[PDB]
mmCIF file of all heavy atoms in Angstrom:
data_model
loop_
_atom_site.group_PDB
_atom_site.id
_atom_site.type_symbol
_atom_site.label_atom_id
_atom_site.label_comp_id
_atom_site.label_asym_id
_atom_site.label_seq_id
_atom_site.Cartn_x
_atom_site.Cartn_y
_atom_site.Cartn_z
ATOM 1 N N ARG A 1 127.195 111.104 109.527
ATOM 2 C CA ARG A 1 128.338 110.232 109.317
ATOM 3 C C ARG A 1 127.835 108.836 108.973
ATOM 4 O O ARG A 1 126.645 108.535 109.098
ATOM 5 C CB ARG A 1 129.235 110.204 110.559
ATOM 6 C CG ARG A 1 129.734 111.569 110.995
ATOM 7 C CD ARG A 1 130.009 111.583 112.489
ATOM 8 N NE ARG A 1 128.793 111.314 113.250
ATOM 9 C CZ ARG A 1 128.762 111.094 114.560
ATOM 10 N NH1 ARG A 1 129.886 111.107 115.264
ATOM 11 N NH2 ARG A 1 127.606 110.856 115.163
ATOM 12 N N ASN A 2 128.758 107.980 108.523
ATOM 13 C CA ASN A 2 128.392 106.599 108.219
ATOM 14 C C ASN A 2 127.827 105.893 109.445
ATOM 15 O O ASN A 2 126.930 105.048 109.327
ATOM 16 C CB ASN A 2 129.599 105.832 107.677
ATOM 17 C CG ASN A 2 129.944 106.210 106.252
ATOM 18 O OD1 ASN A 2 129.351 105.696 105.304
ATOM 19 N ND2 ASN A 2 130.919 107.095 106.091
ATOM 20 N N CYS A 3 128.331 106.239 110.632
ATOM 21 C CA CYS A 3 127.883 105.569 111.849
ATOM 22 C C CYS A 3 126.434 105.904 112.191
ATOM 23 O O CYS A 3 125.766 105.121 112.873
ATOM 24 C CB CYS A 3 128.802 105.932 113.012
ATOM 25 S SG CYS A 3 128.913 107.700 113.349
ATOM 26 N N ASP A 4 125.937 107.060 111.746
ATOM 27 C CA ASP A 4 124.522 107.370 111.930
ATOM 28 C C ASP A 4 123.657 106.450 111.079
ATOM 29 O O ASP A 4 122.644 105.919 111.556
ATOM 30 C CB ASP A 4 124.260 108.840 111.588
ATOM 31 C CG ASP A 4 125.095 109.797 112.433
ATOM 32 O OD1 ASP A 4 125.155 109.596 113.664
ATOM 33 O OD2 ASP A 4 125.700 110.737 111.869
ATOM 34 N N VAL A 5 124.048 106.250 109.817
ATOM 35 C CA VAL A 5 123.351 105.310 108.941
ATOM 36 C C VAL A 5 123.380 103.909 109.537
ATOM 37 O O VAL A 5 122.364 103.202 109.562
ATOM 38 C CB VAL A 5 123.974 105.330 107.534
ATOM 39 C CG1 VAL A 5 123.277 104.328 106.625
ATOM 40 C CG2 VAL A 5 123.921 106.730 106.947
ATOM 41 N N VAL A 6 124.549 103.484 110.025
ATOM 42 C CA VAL A 6 124.671 102.150 110.611
ATOM 43 C C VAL A 6 123.785 102.022 111.845
ATOM 44 O O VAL A 6 123.134 100.992 112.056
ATOM 45 C CB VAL A 6 126.144 101.840 110.935
ATOM 46 C CG1 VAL A 6 126.250 100.583 111.786
ATOM 47 C CG2 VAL A 6 126.945 101.684 109.652
ATOM 48 N N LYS A 7 123.745 103.065 112.677
ATOM 49 C CA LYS A 7 122.865 103.065 113.842
ATOM 50 C C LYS A 7 121.410 102.881 113.426
ATOM 51 O O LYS A 7 120.678 102.063 114.000
ATOM 52 C CB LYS A 7 123.047 104.370 114.618
ATOM 53 C CG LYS A 7 122.582 104.338 116.064
ATOM 54 C CD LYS A 7 122.679 105.721 116.696
ATOM 55 C CE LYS A 7 124.057 106.342 116.482
ATOM 56 N NZ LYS A 7 124.128 107.748 116.978
ATOM 57 N N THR A 8 120.984 103.627 112.403
ATOM 58 C CA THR A 8 119.620 103.491 111.903
ATOM 59 C C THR A 8 119.353 102.075 111.403
ATOM 60 O O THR A 8 118.294 101.499 111.676
ATOM 61 C CB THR A 8 119.370 104.507 110.790
ATOM 62 O OG1 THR A 8 119.634 105.827 111.280
ATOM 63 C CG2 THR A 8 117.927 104.422 110.318
ATOM 64 N N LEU A 9 120.303 101.501 110.661
ATOM 65 C CA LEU A 9 120.143 100.133 110.172
ATOM 66 C C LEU A 9 119.986 99.153 111.327
ATOM 67 O O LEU A 9 119.142 98.250 111.284
ATOM 68 C CB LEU A 9 121.337 99.744 109.301
ATOM 69 C CG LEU A 9 121.478 100.444 107.951
ATOM 70 C CD1 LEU A 9 122.772 100.019 107.282
ATOM 71 C CD2 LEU A 9 120.287 100.139 107.058
ATOM 72 N N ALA A 10 120.804 99.311 112.371
ATOM 73 C CA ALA A 10 120.677 98.451 113.542
ATOM 74 C C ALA A 10 119.303 98.596 114.182
ATOM 75 O O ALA A 10 118.745 97.619 114.698
ATOM 76 C CB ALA A 10 121.777 98.768 114.555
ATOM 77 N N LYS A 11 118.734 99.804 114.145
ATOM 78 C CA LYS A 11 117.391 99.987 114.691
ATOM 79 C C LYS A 11 116.333 99.316 113.818
ATOM 80 O O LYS A 11 115.382 98.720 114.338
ATOM 81 C CB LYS A 11 117.092 101.476 114.860
ATOM 82 C CG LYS A 11 116.800 101.879 116.296
ATOM 83 C CD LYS A 11 116.672 103.386 116.438
ATOM 84 C CE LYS A 11 117.981 104.086 116.109
ATOM 85 N NZ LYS A 11 117.884 105.563 116.289
ATOM 86 N N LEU A 12 116.476 99.405 112.491
ATOM 87 C CA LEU A 12 115.519 98.764 111.594
ATOM 88 C C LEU A 12 115.586 97.246 111.684
ATOM 89 O O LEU A 12 114.566 96.572 111.497
ATOM 90 C CB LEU A 12 115.766 99.203 110.151
ATOM 91 C CG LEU A 12 115.346 100.617 109.755
ATOM 92 C CD1 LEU A 12 115.752 100.899 108.319
ATOM 93 C CD2 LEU A 12 113.848 100.795 109.932
ATOM 94 N N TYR A 13 116.772 96.696 111.956
ATOM 95 C CA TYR A 13 116.932 95.248 112.034
ATOM 96 C C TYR A 13 116.011 94.640 113.087
ATOM 97 O O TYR A 13 115.428 93.571 112.871
ATOM 98 C CB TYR A 13 118.396 94.914 112.338
ATOM 99 C CG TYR A 13 118.789 93.455 112.188
ATOM 100 C CD1 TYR A 13 119.337 92.981 111.003
ATOM 101 C CD2 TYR A 13 118.638 92.558 113.241
ATOM 102 C CE1 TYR A 13 119.710 91.652 110.865
ATOM 103 C CE2 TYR A 13 119.007 91.229 113.111
ATOM 104 C CZ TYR A 13 119.541 90.783 111.921
ATOM 105 O OH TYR A 13 119.910 89.465 111.786
ATOM 106 N N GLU A 14 115.859 95.315 114.226
ATOM 107 C CA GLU A 14 115.136 94.779 115.374
ATOM 108 C C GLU A 14 113.641 95.066 115.338
ATOM 109 O O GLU A 14 112.926 94.657 116.261
ATOM 110 C CB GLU A 14 115.728 95.338 116.672
ATOM 111 C CG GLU A 14 117.239 95.186 116.789
ATOM 112 C CD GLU A 14 117.683 93.738 116.910
ATOM 113 O OE1 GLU A 14 116.859 92.887 117.308
ATOM 114 O OE2 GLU A 14 118.861 93.453 116.604
ATOM 115 N N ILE A 15 113.155 95.751 114.311
ATOM 116 C CA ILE A 15 111.720 96.047 114.218
ATOM 117 C C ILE A 15 110.958 94.756 113.948
ATOM 118 O O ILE A 15 111.326 94.006 113.027
ATOM 119 C CB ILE A 15 111.459 97.080 113.121
ATOM 120 C CG1 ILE A 15 111.879 98.464 113.608
ATOM 121 C CG2 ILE A 15 109.997 97.087 112.715
ATOM 122 C CD1 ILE A 15 111.212 98.861 114.905
ATOM 123 N N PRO A 16 109.920 94.440 114.722
ATOM 124 C CA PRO A 16 109.129 93.238 114.438
ATOM 125 C C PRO A 16 108.435 93.338 113.087
ATOM 126 O O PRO A 16 108.041 94.417 112.642
ATOM 127 C CB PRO A 16 108.109 93.203 115.584
ATOM 128 C CG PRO A 16 108.698 94.059 116.660
ATOM 129 C CD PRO A 16 109.485 95.117 115.956
ATOM 130 N N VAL A 17 108.283 92.181 112.434
ATOM 131 C CA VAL A 17 107.588 92.120 111.151
ATOM 132 C C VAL A 17 106.150 92.606 111.277
ATOM 133 O O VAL A 17 105.529 92.981 110.275
ATOM 134 C CB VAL A 17 107.649 90.680 110.593
ATOM 135 C CG1 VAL A 17 107.255 90.651 109.126
ATOM 136 C CG2 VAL A 17 109.040 90.099 110.782
ATOM 137 N N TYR A 18 105.610 92.611 112.497
ATOM 138 C CA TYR A 18 104.277 93.150 112.751
ATOM 139 C C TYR A 18 104.157 94.588 112.254
ATOM 140 O O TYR A 18 103.174 94.950 111.594
ATOM 141 C CB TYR A 18 103.984 93.059 114.250
ATOM 142 C CG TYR A 18 102.577 93.418 114.658
ATOM 143 C CD1 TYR A 18 101.541 92.505 114.519
ATOM 144 C CD2 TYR A 18 102.291 94.658 115.214
ATOM 145 C CE1 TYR A 18 100.255 92.824 114.902
ATOM 146 C CE2 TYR A 18 101.009 94.988 115.600
ATOM 147 C CZ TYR A 18 99.993 94.067 115.442
ATOM 148 O OH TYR A 18 98.712 94.390 115.826
ATOM 149 N N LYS A 19 105.156 95.423 112.558
ATOM 150 C CA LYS A 19 105.139 96.808 112.094
ATOM 151 C C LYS A 19 105.165 96.879 110.572
ATOM 152 O O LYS A 19 104.466 97.703 109.965
ATOM 153 C CB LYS A 19 106.327 97.575 112.674
ATOM 154 C CG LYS A 19 106.524 97.418 114.175
ATOM 155 C CD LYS A 19 105.403 98.069 114.966
ATOM 156 C CE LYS A 19 105.648 97.946 116.463
ATOM 157 N NZ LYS A 19 104.537 98.538 117.258
ATOM 158 N N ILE A 20 105.975 96.026 109.939
ATOM 159 C CA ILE A 20 106.056 95.999 108.482
ATOM 160 C C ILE A 20 104.709 95.628 107.880
ATOM 161 O O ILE A 20 104.312 96.158 106.835
ATOM 162 C CB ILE A 20 107.162 95.030 108.024
ATOM 163 C CG1 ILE A 20 108.469 95.312 108.769
ATOM 164 C CG2 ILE A 20 107.361 95.116 106.520
ATOM 165 C CD1 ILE A 20 109.011 96.704 108.554
ATOM 166 N N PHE A 21 103.982 94.715 108.528
ATOM 167 C CA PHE A 21 102.674 94.329 108.015
ATOM 168 C C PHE A 21 101.605 95.377 108.304
ATOM 169 O O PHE A 21 100.601 95.438 107.588
ATOM 170 C CB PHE A 21 102.263 92.974 108.591
ATOM 171 C CG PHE A 21 102.715 91.798 107.764
ATOM 172 C CD1 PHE A 21 103.914 91.159 108.034
ATOM 173 C CD2 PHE A 21 101.938 91.333 106.715
ATOM 174 C CE1 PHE A 21 104.330 90.082 107.275
ATOM 175 C CE2 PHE A 21 102.349 90.255 105.951
ATOM 176 C CZ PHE A 21 103.547 89.628 106.231
ATOM 177 N N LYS A 22 101.789 96.199 109.339
ATOM 178 C CA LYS A 22 100.866 97.308 109.564
ATOM 179 C C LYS A 22 101.061 98.396 108.515
ATOM 180 O O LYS A 22 100.105 98.801 107.833
ATOM 181 C CB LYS A 22 101.053 97.869 110.974
ATOM 182 C CG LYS A 22 100.460 96.992 112.062
ATOM 183 C CD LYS A 22 98.940 97.045 112.038
ATOM 184 C CE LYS A 22 98.341 96.210 113.156
ATOM 185 N NZ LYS A 22 96.853 96.251 113.157
ATOM 186 N N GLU A 23 102.300 98.878 108.367
ATOM 187 C CA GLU A 23 102.603 99.836 107.307
ATOM 188 C C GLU A 23 102.191 99.294 105.942
ATOM 189 O O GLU A 23 101.744 100.051 105.071
ATOM 190 C CB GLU A 23 104.093 100.175 107.326
ATOM 191 C CG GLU A 23 104.514 101.228 106.319
ATOM 192 C CD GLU A 23 103.815 102.555 106.539
ATOM 193 O OE1 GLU A 23 104.333 103.373 107.329
ATOM 194 O OE2 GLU A 23 102.745 102.777 105.931
ATOM 195 N N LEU A 24 102.331 97.980 105.742
ATOM 196 C CA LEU A 24 101.810 97.352 104.533
ATOM 197 C C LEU A 24 100.294 97.484 104.456
ATOM 198 O O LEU A 24 99.743 97.788 103.390
ATOM 199 C CB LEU A 24 102.224 95.879 104.491
ATOM 200 C CG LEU A 24 101.404 94.915 103.622
ATOM 201 C CD1 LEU A 24 101.501 95.282 102.159
ATOM 202 C CD2 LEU A 24 101.851 93.475 103.839
#
């Protein structure tokens, strides 16, 4: 459902930029 996508987005919002720079 749309709410599952929204839940995932809310989870991605709170990820520290540290993780983004590691995956980078």
Side-chain angles (χ1 to χ4, degrees):
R1 303 153 298 171
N2 286 277
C3 58
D4 302 314
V5 179
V6 169
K7 200 186 309 174
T8 304
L9 291 175
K11 240 173 296 182
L12 286 176
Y13 191 94
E14 309 293 338
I15 285 305
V17 194
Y18 187 80
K19 311 292 182 182
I20 310 300
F21 271 93
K22 285 288 182 180
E23 184 61 88
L24 158 64

